[PDB]
Each structure stands twice: as C-alpha cells, then as structure tokens.
Amino acid sequence: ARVTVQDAVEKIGNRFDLVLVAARRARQMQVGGKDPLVPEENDKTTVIALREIEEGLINNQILDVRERQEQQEQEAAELQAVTAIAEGRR
Amino acid sequence: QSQLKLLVTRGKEQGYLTYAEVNDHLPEDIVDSDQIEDIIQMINDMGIQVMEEAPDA
Amino acid sequence: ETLRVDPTNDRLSALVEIYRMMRPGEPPTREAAESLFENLFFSEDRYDLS
Amino acid sequence: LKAQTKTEEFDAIKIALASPDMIRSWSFGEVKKPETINYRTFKPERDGLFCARIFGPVKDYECLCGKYKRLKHRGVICEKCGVEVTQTKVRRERMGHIELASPTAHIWFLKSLPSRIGLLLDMPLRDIERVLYFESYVVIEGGMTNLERQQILTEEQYLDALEEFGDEFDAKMGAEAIQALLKSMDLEQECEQLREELNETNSETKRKKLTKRIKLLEAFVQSGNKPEWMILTVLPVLPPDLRPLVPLDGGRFATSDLNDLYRRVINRNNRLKRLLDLAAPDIIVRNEKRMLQEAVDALLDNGRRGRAITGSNKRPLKSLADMIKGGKRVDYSGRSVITVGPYLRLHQCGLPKKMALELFKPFIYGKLELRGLATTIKAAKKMVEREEAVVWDILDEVIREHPVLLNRAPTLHRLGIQAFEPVLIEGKAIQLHPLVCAAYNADFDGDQMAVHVPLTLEAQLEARALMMSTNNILSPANGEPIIVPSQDVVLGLYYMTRDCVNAKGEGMVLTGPKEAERLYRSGLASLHARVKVRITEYEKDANGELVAKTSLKDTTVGRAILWMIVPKGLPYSIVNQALGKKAISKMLNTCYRILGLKPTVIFADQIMYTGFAYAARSGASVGIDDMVIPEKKHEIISEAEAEVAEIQEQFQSGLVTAGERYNKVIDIWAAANDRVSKAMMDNLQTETVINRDGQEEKQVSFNSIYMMADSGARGSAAQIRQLAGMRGLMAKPDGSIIETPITANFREGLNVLQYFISTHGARKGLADTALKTANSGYLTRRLVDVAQDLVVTEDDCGTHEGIMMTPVIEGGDVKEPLRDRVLGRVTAEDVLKPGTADILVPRNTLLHEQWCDLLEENSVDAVKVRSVVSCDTDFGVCAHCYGRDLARGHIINKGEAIGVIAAQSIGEPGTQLTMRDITGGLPRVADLFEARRPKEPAILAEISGIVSFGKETKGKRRLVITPVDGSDPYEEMIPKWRQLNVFEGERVERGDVISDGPEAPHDILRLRGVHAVTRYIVNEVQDVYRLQGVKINDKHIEVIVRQMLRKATIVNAGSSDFLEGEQVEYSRVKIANRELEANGKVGATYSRDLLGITKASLATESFISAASFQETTRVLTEAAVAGKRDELRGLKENVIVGRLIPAGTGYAYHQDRMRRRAAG
Ligand SMILES: [Mg+2]
Ligand SMILES: [Zn+2]
Ligand SMILES: [Zn+2]
C-alpha cells in the first residue's frame, strides 16, 4: 500500500477517518505490543497498518472492541490489587 | 452645511478612495496627525450608514 | 471667480493667511508673516531653480 | 464535582474590560522606578521595569544576590531579596502593574472611530469629550436646578452657576470627572426610559439613532462590564522578556521601544504623585496630568496624534497596539534548486544525500541507538557528523516509507504541496517527477522548492493518504487530469502515431508484442504504412469482468508497440489510432474513470517512459529551414500596401472620410496579416510528396516545428505566425495601433525601427503580467477570508430544489454549445424522460451515466440539480448537494474543506486573466463577486401591473413610471437621462426589463430570485473564463455565492428585532424552532440579501478570526466592550491559537468536543 491507499478507503469511507484509524493502529505497533497481522517485508508501521485495512482486518470497530477486551483483561485479571486497595480507606 | 454637503456629494464614492481631496476642503489649522484617522475610518468597511454616523459625530 | 472666493483683502491679510497655512500654530505677526513668504520664492538661501 | 483550578483544556476564550482589581489580580508587584539595569554591574534594579523580585530571576534557579544558587531552594524566596527562585521563563510570563494617581482615559475606548466612552455616554468626541478632560471646559454630573446633566461650562460659567446655587450640583472636570459621569450613569434605568421615549409617535425621522443606541446600551449592560473600567486607574505591565534589553556584540545593548514608553509614563506619573503632596499650583498639576495622559496614550497605542518620538530615532516608537496590528518559520525543513527526474515514478522524488542526512537527524540518531552502532545519543551525533559509511545505510532505512512533502513558492492551489517517497541521490539538487511538474507551474529556469518532513505519526499518514501525489491525479478545479503528460512526452507519443505512407512500410502483419522485435531489427520503419496486426481487445459490460476480442485492424508500427502500455480494459487501439495532442490526456481520463487509481498511475508512468524514450529516438530538432516562409509573402504584402496606397490617395482627394480612414486601412493590414498567416499554415501544414508505390501523394508536413504545434508541447498558431509569417498589428503607448505592421519576421532580419516598436509590446507584456500576478493573489485572499469556514457536514440532508442546469448557449446568434456542466452532480428528483421513468431521485450523474444523457437524444437539455446554492443545511454543506469533483472520483468525503479548495481553484487561473459593454478580465470577475452596481444600472418592475406616466416631470423630476394593478401602486424614478422600453398602458410582469441595459445583481436577487441571481453570477463569471479559455467547474462559484448570500433582512415581527439584518443561519434555525415552539406569530419572515465578498467576510462570529484580517484595533475593541467569546469553531481562529483544524483529519475531534460541551 505504498502507492494508494485507495484500496483501504473502499473498506472504510472518508479518507480522513482512514488516517485516524490507520494511525491508531500504526501507533499500537510503533510503541507497545506490536504484533502485525500481515507479514512485514521491511515496511514501516506507517504502511503496515494500511496493509491490514486493505486486507480486510483491523477497522475502527475492531480496534475499539479489542480495546474493550484489553481493558477487561487488564482489569478483571488484576482486580485482586484494586479490591485490596478498596479496603484501604474502609 | 459646507463640510457635510461637500463630503457626501463628492464621495460617491471617489472610486479609488481619493484621500488627497477633501482634507484640503477643511477649516482650522491644517497639516495635523490627529484629524487623519477620522477620515480613513469612515469611508470604507461600514459603508452607507457610516457616512451618516460621521456627520453626527 | 477666484477673487469672489478670496477672504483676504490686502497685503497684510494675504501674508498672514499664507503664514497660517504654512505654519499653523503660533500667532502670525508682521516680521514673521512677511519674512516667511519672502523666504519661499524670494530668497536664494531658501529657493533655487538652479 | 470537577471545578479544576489548573491549566487544562479550554473550550473558549472570553474578551472584556478589566477592572482595577482585575489588574491587581495579575500583579506580582508594582513597578515604581524608571530604572532598568545597573550602569556598572549590569544587574536588574530594585523596583524598576526589570525587577527580579516582581517579575522573574535573570539566571534560571539562582536568585539576584546569591544567597541561594542550586535546586535546593526552588520554592522558597530569598532572605535579603524577595526573589522567587524557579525558572527564567517566569520572567516571560509574569505580569505586574503601575498604580496611577489621577484617572487616565484608555486611548482605544476614547478615540477609536466611534467614541465608545462617548456614544455610551452620549457625548461628542474630539469636540466635547476632549475639551472637558484636557482641563479646559468643566462638565456637569447631574443637577436638580437650572443646569442639566451633561452640559459643558467655562470657568466663568462655572463660578456664576456656583454662585447662583452651589454645594448641591457639584461636578468636577478632567479624567476623574468623566469617571463619575460613567459611574453615575445607570444603564438599567436608561435602558427603560430610552425604550419609552424613543417609541412614542415617531416615524422614520428618528428611528435611526433610536434603534442604534438602545441596542448598544442593552449589549453593554448585558456584557457584565461596568463602565468604570472604561478609563483605568491601574495600568498593568508587560512581562520583561517580551520587551527585553539584551547586550549585543561588544556592548551596545538592544532594547524594545516599550521600555521607553513605560519609563516615560513612570517618570510623569511619579512627578504627578509628588506634585500631589508638595505645593499644587492648578496650572502645574493639571498640565502634568495631561502629560501623564500623553505618556499613557502613547504607550497603549501611538497612532494617532503627532506620534511620540525620542529614542534618538527619527521614526516613531512601537507601542503595544502597533505590535499586534496589521512568516512562521519551522524546524525540519529545507530547500534547493529543482531538477527533472525522468527515471522516477509518480510517487517519488530525488532528495539529496547530504540534505536528507541533516533533515532526518533525530530519526537517524534514534535508529542508530536502537540497533547498536552508537552506544549513546551523543555517539550518534558524533557518528553522523563524521558521516561514517554505515550511517548512510541507516539513512536508507529511515526514509524508506517516510513521505516528504514538496512545496513551490507561488502556492495558488492545493496541488502546491504534494508528498513523495524520499529517494537518495548523489547530488545537491532536488529532483522532481516531470508529470506533476505542471501542477506546480514549475519550470527549471533555476526555480527552487522547499521540503518538509512529516514528524508526527498521523502526519505521515496524512501526507500519504491525502497529500500524496498518487492521490492527486485529477485537478480539484476541473475534473480533468492534472498530471497529464506535457511537451516532451507528448511530442514523443505524437511521433508514435502519425501514419506515413510507404517508406519501408507494407502491411506485413503480426501479433502485438512481436512488432517490438520488428522495430529494433530495422527493415521496417515505424510510421508506416498503415500496416495490419492482431489486437487482443478487452471490454466489459453489465456484469463487469472482462471480455476478450481478438481482431485484425490497420494501425502503424508505433500504435502496435504503444498498445503494450495500455492497461487491461479500455476500448483499445482506437485510443492509439488517433495521435498525441489533446486526446493524449483524454486517454488518461477515461482510463481513470473505467479502471481506477493504481491502473491509471502505472499507466501514467509508462506513457511517460514511452514518450521520452521514443522522443529521443525521433530526434526532432529546430534548424533554420524548419520555419518555411510562404512564397506569396512579398506578393501579399505588396497587394496590401497597394490597397492602402489607393486609400491614402482617396483621402488626399477627399472622397472617403479621412477621420476614420485609419480604421479601414488597419482592416486592410489585418486582412493581409490573416492572408500571410493562412498561406504560411496551409503551406507548412500539408506539403511533402513522398512516393507511394507509384508515387505522387500528399499527407502532412514532418516539419518538426509543425509537429510540436500539432501536439501541444508549447507551440501555438500566433507564435508560429510570427516565426515564418509576420508579426501583425503592433500596439502604441497611446493604446492606438500603428498603421504599419511588422512586415518582417524572426526567420528574417528585423529593422531597428520596428523592434523599437515591438519593445513596447514586450515591456507592457511583462509589466501587465507583474500587475495581474499580484492582483490575482489579491483576489484570492478575499475569496479565502470569506469562504474558508464552511465544510460539508451532517452527511446528506433532504431538500430537492436546485438550479435547473442547462447547456450554456450563446447559440442564439453565434452558435456555441457546452453541455458537460452536469456530471458528478446529485439529481434533484426524477427529472422526467420523453415517455416515463428513467432518472432516479438522488442518483448522482455518473461519468458513464452522463454519457447516457445522450441516448435520450438532444431533446433532454434540462435537468434540476441540487447545489450548494440551495441545500437546507444550517452551518455547513450537504454532501449530496455538492457533487464529487476532486482528485478523488467519488463524492466529497464528509468533513472535507470545500471553502479553501473553491477559492484556490477560482484564483489559481488568475495568473492568466487580461485586465480590460464588456469589461472582461480579472477586474470583471472581482466586480461580479463584490456585487457592484453598474455605472448605468437598468430598472425592473417590482410588481406586475399597468405601466403609466406618473406626472410628467413634477418634482424635481425627471420621468416617473407607475406599474399599478390588482392592489396598491408604485412610483419608480426615471432621471430623463437614458430612454425607455415600454409605452404607456402596456402591462408588465414581476421583474421585467424597462431600461434594456446592464443588470444589477442586487435587484435580481431582491426581485427576480435566488436561482436567478446565482445563475447570473455563475454564467457571467464563466463568460470571462470562456474568452480567456480557462476551464473551471461551476460548483466552486456556487460555493462562494452560497455564503455570499449568508445574511438576510427580516421584515415583520418576531423574537428578532425587525430592522436587524441577520443571517439565515440563526434565522432558519429559529424560525423552524418557533412554528412548533409557542407560536409562529412570535417570528417574522426574512428576505435574502446580496452582499459582496468583502462585505460578507467583514461579518463573522469569531472576533479573533476578524482580528486576523480586518482592522485589529477596531474589532478587538468593540468585541472587548460587549462580553464576547469565541468558542471556537472557525478555521482561521483555530489556526493562530495552534490547535486541531475543525475539518478533514480533525472534524471528528471537534464534533466530539462540540457535543462534549453540552453538559455546561
Ligand atoms: Mg521559472
Ligand atoms: Zn537572594
Ligand atoms: Zn443539502
């Protein structure tokens, strides 16, 4: 997708929304848990996110849901510390 | 009378805002740096009605 | 028509009006009103067509 | 339970007057001395303009004296010197104040066009407000006998009135007098009594001043500001760092003028305070107060009255206002001379090795320390500063898919800045793709372009998904391709057609690709014969896909090999069967519409490679024998001068009107010029003989020059006519034409005389260019300022109404049709069909479906279409109602930026407009947009009635027409001057012509209709683009006319107050919310009002946005008076504040925050 980037907008209209979600994913890759889905092949996170969007995976709703599960994974799994702190001030 | 009639009738609208015109058709001591801004302000921007605010001021 | 629109009537009022037009401020006198108009088109140190 | 008290996110900014206590709140101390820095130690004085205790410390964390040095005491003030030891940037943010003895008038609210302090108080400005506060004529402050409430008295009148009464009407003079006047003024009780008195039995002889002041008083009282704040008793002080005095090179300090201002005001203020303790002679003290007035007024804003001077400079001093009344340098940037780069792709650019090395410096650092190589960050610096081989390979990694965006000086439109993938090149020059070299209007005269590095992550994706060159295939202005092949490439593909007969020809047939082998191996030529070959075509229909079609067609060598470049689809061959001229772009266009982006992009690179390569093979040059003069030149010239000779002899013997024989003899030479021009072209066009089989035949000249002209590549008829034909009628400085045209031409010698004549043309050519180039941008600035706030929103509203689109027809008496003005347009509603059905309701007319509007014959030449002119949107634009025309093929993306793109496209071709019942040119465009009444305006019938004379010249007067019918009459005023067009007794319709002259857009909108006036502006502004031959879509004209018709005027009775001319934005939203709120009778009907670009842009919600272009001193003041607040939706105002733009990649952010600000 190093020359449009047009195939990606077909999967999600509004080229502006495309930039937001693609940057959102490219941000996840650059810093934090990387884990690309399409093979890298020496491509920057800039384009890697766009390759995914073209492929059909990783859209706006998809990331939001995986963030919901990510939150349920960080919270529900480590609630033993929060509940312990909850009894701190009665 | 003189200032009001001359200003209005002439400026319609003097095309390219001919500043160097009516300032000579004014009394009192000339060559001032005070009366200047009071003319550049009225002519444009708020046309028509501004030319009725000028005389009353 | 030019005379019909001329406020001044003599040499004093003329030189005085010119003195008030050129240097609007101080009260026009005799020496000042005269010497000024003379030092405009009638003085080598103040005027020259070359 | 928020109520946070820190510097968090803000949704709006407020502007208003500042109370004396409001100033104190900012005060981190009081300046009391005119002193700045020490004469010997160069140290901040105690309580001077540059105090350390009041403002901030000199050094970062060490105090003034030196009792405390390091970070040990960063929160504690020093013992010997109350110096808070934090940062030095504290010095940049700390306020402070000066407290004056006697009150002082704020120069802005005193003398800034309308007297704010005066009109609020109802009092003359430079007449009365001056003489009473300059200590000359005492003023009254309310009396219950003899005297009134604001009369002006003299010393003699004062004591007389004091003697008669006194001690019960006390009223001072000066600043503090006006203070008590503004303070004693009750905005409440006056707001009531003014409403009472100024509504009692008064026609239109008073209502002017009535409505004006009452609105002004209601605003100010509701503003929250107390009129006490108008004149200040406490003057705040600007932070020292914003007006420093810094040592330059070898002494010689450099200080701001504000220090002179603050130092003066301090001196005069302290002297005043001293005189208000010692002996106080009225003359001495009152003068010093006036002197304090001078200093303060000069410090706030010089302007204005003589201009304070001093400071050794004969030039005035830059006061506070002049520093904020009236280009953004940026890091990670560079520039260099541009160079052609043929080997590049459409998404690539040659970025110099050393250039890119310095530009990606922080990226190289990070990637070095990331991999290894450099042990630390400073090692990376030392490693790249010593460009150590390996670093270059790291560089090749960092610029990989990291787009860089290029920019040229004259940025007329969006395509001025386009992004590419950086390509390392061993050189110091920046190479560019020769296809987008036309979008920049860039040549290689030594022109130079700048480069920017998208640092932010989404900044790269923005450059890749929006600004990337591959996404800019079509022009935003017109749907046609912009990256279309130019001079070199086009001549190339023109050479790959051009069927020449025989000459190593013959119709030896084969199969496409094999023909390549035939050309390289000689034997056969290339431009023959014609020759037949097998073409495997591919087409699609209904269910798409692809359908093969092998056949045998008669093409040429060039067409066969060129066929390889053509993409999968397309009609094939026939696109090559033509030539290379304008269809060269046509081929690219259709490919884009039937294939898509990528197939068109690669197709562009391929046709570029092809054109260049085969153009080199062709070796077209320009010898001296290439521009062949006609043989009948001397003949035609002799015949033309023979004719004029007879005409001169006639003039000698009277006969013919000598007064205008000049005109007819010019017609002689003008005909003669056309004769030589026609002869030169007909000769240089055909010619040739060749020798096919049995010889004798004719084609078209292979005369290089002709080939360039017959294939774009900068070669027009006029220029060629000057080369071989003759330079025709030459202009004279007077403006008149010389009756002795340049008989000779450039192929021949040129006599000194006619060259000294032609130099006038060259001089005025370059000069007129220099003017219209700056005037073009001058127009664009106005277009942008007015239009750059609207963006397509709320997806796709309802509404069906819209201008009925019809082919622009001058064919009434000249025959000239143009019917491509409907495409990518959303249909109003099922626009009929000679029978039934067909066209849907909201179906956007596709490119292939506009071609379907020819299958319904020439009968259907009218379709109602939704436009930005209509659209029942509120503060934006319906997506459907707009269209689609972009570099993109689909409809405009929701939350684009229609405004700026519209203005750009309109003012981009401004470079090519010639300034002058037909004005014509850029000036005509301006007048049409400004909506200026003609020098001889026509007149229309407001109501349909019976025309009859209304008292023949009985005024005054000057004729009078009275169209009366049904009910009620009218009396129009005809000034004798100029005739008429309708006899007495005859009837007229609602808006009929009765002057047969130039029409005024004001009357058309006011009477004829909105569709009529907008149709007028678009069709009339286009007509000047028709002559200049510049293609520009009608959409953008409608876009500006949209908010050109932004505001209206209400005439009835509603929640809005009648005479107020308010915009349909608030109107429509408020009239919709009243029919179903309480009653429709609590609201009035409005009336659209035409106002020009400037007059429209003058009005806008944001006060910061206004403070951008219009007079900042004015807008900021009047916006200060009333409790105004920007909050905060516009583009321009949201740029200077330095935040996300409410459009495009933003928009979503603003929409979220906009709804977010609904809780409170
Ligand atoms: Mg150039
Ligand atoms: Zn200290
Ligand atoms: Zn709409």
Q: Please give the Cα distance from A37 to D245 (Å, whole number).
A: 59
Cα torsion at D895, D896, D898, D903 (round to 10°)? Answer: 140
CB contact set of D840 (below 8 Å; sequence gap of 6+): D827, D830
Concatenating the DSSP letter of every residue in D20-82 gives: HHHHHHH-SSB---S--B-SSS--B-SSSTT-TTTT--SSSSS-SSSS--SGGGSSSBPSSS-
On whether any CB of chain B is under 8 Å from the CB of D91, the answer is no
| Chain D residues touching residue A30 (CB < 8 angstroms) | 457
Q: Does C24 touch chain B (CB under 8 A)?
A: yes
Q: For D143, which DSSP code?
A: -
Cα separations in angstroms, B28 against B32, C17, D123, D898: 10, 12, 22, 54
Give the C-alpha separation, D917 to D105, whole Å: 55
Give the integer Cα–Cα distance in Å for D1124 and D1137.
17
D865: which strand partners? D827
CA–centroid distance, D865 to ligand 3, in Å, is 11
- Provide CB contacts within 8 A for A22, sequence distance 6+: A8, A49, A50, A53, D461, D465
CB contacts, 8 Å: D895 with chain A: 14, 16
Distance CA D501, CA D528 (A): 6
Instruction: Report the C-alpha gap between D938 and D981 in whole angstroms.
Output: 11
Distance of alpha carbon D143 from alpha carbon D1078, whole angstroms: 47
Nearest-CB residue to B37 (from D208, D304, D1110)? D304
Q: Does D645 touch chain A (CB under 8 A)?
A: no
Calculate how close chain B gets to D1125, using CA atoms only, in Å: 22
Q: Radius of gyration over alpha carbons of chain A, in Å?
A: 17
- 């090692």: which residue's tokens? D379
Instruction: Give the three-state DSSP class for D338.
Output: strand
Is residue D593 within 8 Å of residue D848, measured between CB atoms?
yes
Residue D444: closest CA among D403, D478, D405, D488? D488
Give D39: exposed, middle or buried? Use CB within 10 Å, 0-12, 13-18, 19+: exposed
Distance CA(D961)–CA(D359), nearest Å, equals 75
Q: D451 in helix, strand or coil?
A: strand
Spell out the SS3 assignment of D749-805. Answer: CCCHHHHHHHHHHHHHHHHHHHHHHHHHHHHHHHHHHHHCCCCECCCCCCCCCCCEE
CA atoms within 13 A on the CB side of D594: 22
Whether D341 contacts D449, CB under 8 Å: no
Please report which helix (H) or strand (E) contains residue D312, including its range: none
Handedness of CA D267, D272, D278, D284 (dihedral sign): positive
CB D181 within 8 A of CB D139: yes
Ordered alpha helix ranges (H), D277-410: 282-300, 353-359, 361-371, 377-385, 390-398
Separation between Cα atoms, residue D490 and residue D482, nearest integer Å: 14
DSSP conformational letter for D1125: E
Annotated binding site of D for Zn(2+): 63, 65, 78, 81, 797, 871, 878, 881
Enter the tokens of residue D354.
């050393």
CA distances for D568 relative to A4, D538, D587, D848, angstroms: 19, 7, 13, 18
Contacts of B34 in chain C (CB under 8 A): none
Contact present, D566 and D539 (Cβ < 8 Å): no
Phi, psi of D547 (to 5 degrees): -125, 115
> Which position has the token pair 């502004």?
D1021
Positive or negative, the CA dihedral D926, D928, D933, D935 is positive
Label residue D1036 left, alpha or beta by phi (over 0 means left) and psi (-120 to 50 means alpha): alpha
Of D360, D337, D518, nearest to D453 (Cα)?
Answer: D360
Q: How far is CA D65 from CA D39, D58, D69, D252, D309, in A?
A: 17, 11, 10, 25, 36
**Rounded CA separation D111/D132 (Å):** 14
What is the bridge-based pairing of β-strands D245-247 and D804-805?
unpaired
Please classify residue D1129 by burial: count the beta carbons closer than 10 Å to its beta carbon, then call 0-12 exposed, 13-18 middle and 19+ buried: middle
Contacts of D420 in chain A (CB under 8 A): none
What is the whole-number distance in angstroms between the Cα of residue D434 and the centre of ligand 1?
Answer: 14
Helices (runs of H) and strands (runs of E) counted in chain D: 40, 22
Task: Test D113 with B33 for CB contact under 8 angstroms.
Answer: no
With contact defined as beta carbons under 8 Å apart, do D235 and D98 qualify? yes
Cα dihedral D1058, D1060, D1064, D1070 in deg (nearest 10): -50
- Report DSSP state, residue D450: E
CA separation for the pair D822, D863 (Å, rounded):
8
Residue C9 exposed, middle or buried by CB count within 10 Å (0-12, 13-18, 19+)? exposed
| SS (HEC) of D1031-1073 | CCCHHHHHHHHHHHCCEEEECCCCCCCCCCCCEHHHHHHHHHC
DSSP per-residue string spanning D455-485: -SHHHHHHHHHTSBGGG--B-SSSSSBSS--
Q: How far apart are CA D991 and CA D22, in angstroms?
A: 59
CA of D39 to the centre of ligand 2 (A): 20
| D869 in Cβ contact with D802 (< 8 Å) | yes
C-A interface (Cβ pairs under 8 Å ≥ 3): no
Contact D988, D944 (CB under 8 A): yes
Cα–Cα distances in angstroms (integers) from residue D587 to residues D545, D578, D607, D886, in the given order:
21, 10, 11, 19
> How far apart are alpha carbons C43 and C37 in whole angstroms?
9
Furthest CA-CA distance within chain D: 130
Q: How far is D618 from chain A (nearest CA, A)?
A: 33
Number of domain units in chain B: 1
Q: How far apart are CA D1005 and CA D1010, in angstroms?
A: 5
DSSP state of D712: -
Smallest CA–CA distance from D465 into chain A, residue: A5
Helix (H, G, I), strand (E, B) or coil at D876: coil
Task: Flag whether residue C18 sits within 8 Å of chain B, measured between CB atoms.
Answer: no
Taking the C-alpha atoms of residue B38 and residue B43, their distance in angstroms, rounded to an integer, is 9
Structure-token match 């996300």, residue found: D1140
CB-based contact B34 D125, cutoff 8 Å = no
* Structure tokens that stand for D1002 in this block: 């004001």
Of D306, D241, D297, the closest CA to residue D265 belongs to D297
Whole-angstrom distance, CA of residue B20 vs CA of residue B36? 11
SS3 label, residue D100? strand
Interface of B with D in 24-53 (CB under 8 A): 33-34, 37-38, 41-42, 45, 52-53
| CA gap D1042, D868 in Å, rounded | 6
Q: How far apart are CA D102 and CA D273, in angstroms?
A: 9
Kindly report the nearest CA distance between residue D421 and chain A, in angstroms.
Answer: 9
The whole-angstrom distance between residue D896's C-alpha and the CA centroid of its chain comes to 17
Q: CA-CA distance, D179 to D173, in Å (whole number)?
A: 10
How far is the C-alpha of D693 from the C-alpha of D506, rounded, in Å? 10
- State the Cα–Cα distance between residues D346 and D330, nearest whole angstrom: 27
* Chain mean position to CA B21: 9
* A/D Cβ contact: 3+ pairs below 8 Å: yes
**Which CA distances in Å does D465 have to D333, D415, D661, D1050?**
21, 14, 65, 46
d(CA D1105, CA D1099): 10
Those residues whose C-beta lies under 8 Å from the C-beta of residue D259, and which sit 6 or more positions away, are D36, D49, D243, D245
Is the CATH code 1.10.760.10 the one for domain D631-763? no
> Which three-class secondary structure state does DSSP give residue D180?
helix
Contact C43, B52 (CB under 8 A): no
List the one residue out of D429, D356, D451, D355 whose CA is nearest residue D394.
D356
Strands (DSSP E) along D469-545, which ranges? Answer: 529-539
D865 is written with which tokens? Answer: 């279409």
Bridging pattern class, strands D547-556 and D430-432? unpaired
Angle at D808 between CA D911 and CA D991, to 5 degrees: 105
Task: For residue D486, report the phi and psi dihedrals to the nearest 5 degrees.
Answer: -110, -155
Mutate to test the interface with D, among A4, A12, A54 (most CBs of D within 10 A): A4
User: Among candidates D367, D358, D354, which has minimal Cα distance to D398?
Assistant: D367
Residues A6, D449 contacting (CB under 8 angstroms) = no
Question: How close B14 comes to chain D (CA, Å)?
Answer: 13
Query: Containing H/E element for D417?
Result: strand D417-425
Residue D834 token pair: 């000679």
- Return residues 26-55 of A near D (CB < 8 Å): 26-27, 30, 42-47, 50
Ramachandran class of D1025: left when φ > 0, alpha when ψ lies in -120 to 50, beta otherwise: alpha
Distance in angstroms (rounded) separating the CA atoms of residues D831 and D186: 64
Among A34, A68, A36, smallest CA distance to A50 is for A36
How do D417-425 and D348-352 pair as beta strands? parallel
Collapsing DSSP to helix, strand or coil, D980 comes out as coil
Residue B8 CB contacts under 8 Å (≥ 6 apart), including other chains: B51, B55
Euclidean distance between CA atoms D36 and D640, whole angstroms: 85
Q: What is the sign of the dihedral through the CA atoms of D922, D926, D929 and D932?
A: negative
Q: How many helices (H) and strands (E) does chain B have?
A: 3, 0
Place of tokens 């030891």: D85
Sign (positive or negative) of CA dihedral D246, D248, D251, D252: negative
Domain region containing B43? 1-57
Among A4, A15, A42, the residue with its CB nearest the CB of D893 is A15
**Preceding peptide of D304 cis, ω within 30°:** yes
Q: Which long-range contacts (CB under 8 A, 24 or more apart) does A21-27 make?
A: A21/A53, A21/A58, A21/A59, A21/A60, A21/A63, A22/A49, A22/A50, A22/A53, A22/D461, A22/D465, A23/A49, A23/D457, A23/D458, A23/D461, A24/A49, A24/A63, A25/A49, A25/A52, A25/A53, A25/A58, A25/A63, A26/D457, A26/D461, A27/D457
Measure CA of the first residue to CA of the last residue in chain D; give whole Å: 12
B&C contacts, CB < 8 Å: 8
Q: Report yes or no: D1002 and D1010 within 8 Å, Cβ to Cβ.
A: no
* Token pair of D18 as six digits: 């500042």
Contacts of D598 in chain A (CB under 8 A): 3-4, 6-7
Q: In terms of Cα–Cα distance, which of D631, D616, D647, D714 is closest to D680? A: D631
The answer to whether D114 touches D228, Cβ cutoff 8 Å, is no
Asked if B11 contacts B43 with a C-beta cutoff of 8 angstroms, the reply is: yes
Structure tokens at D644: 């004029």
CATH superfamily of A1-90: RNA polymerase subunit, RPB6/omega (3.90.940.10)
Cα separation, D114 vs D108, in Å, equals: 10
Strand partners, D844: D826
CB burial readout D543-574, b (16+ within 10 A) else e:
eeeeeeeeeebebbbbbbbbbebbbebbebbe
The set of residues, in sequence order, having a beta carbon less than 8 Å from that of D216 and lying 6+ positions away, is D119, D120
Calpha distance D790→D779 (Å, rounded): 19
- Strands D245-247 and D253-255 turn out to be antiparallel
Determine the Cα–Cα distance for residues D638 and D644; give it in Å rounded to an integer: 10
Report the chain D residue with the minimal C-alpha distance to residue A29: D457
Provide the residue type at D554 as one letter.
Answer: D
CA–CA gap between residue D730 and residue D740 (Å, rounded): 8
SS3 letters across D909-950 = HHHHCCCCCCCCCHHHHHHHHHCCCCCCCCCECCCCCECCEC
- Enumerate the residues of chain A whose CB falls inside 8 A of the CB of residue D596: 6
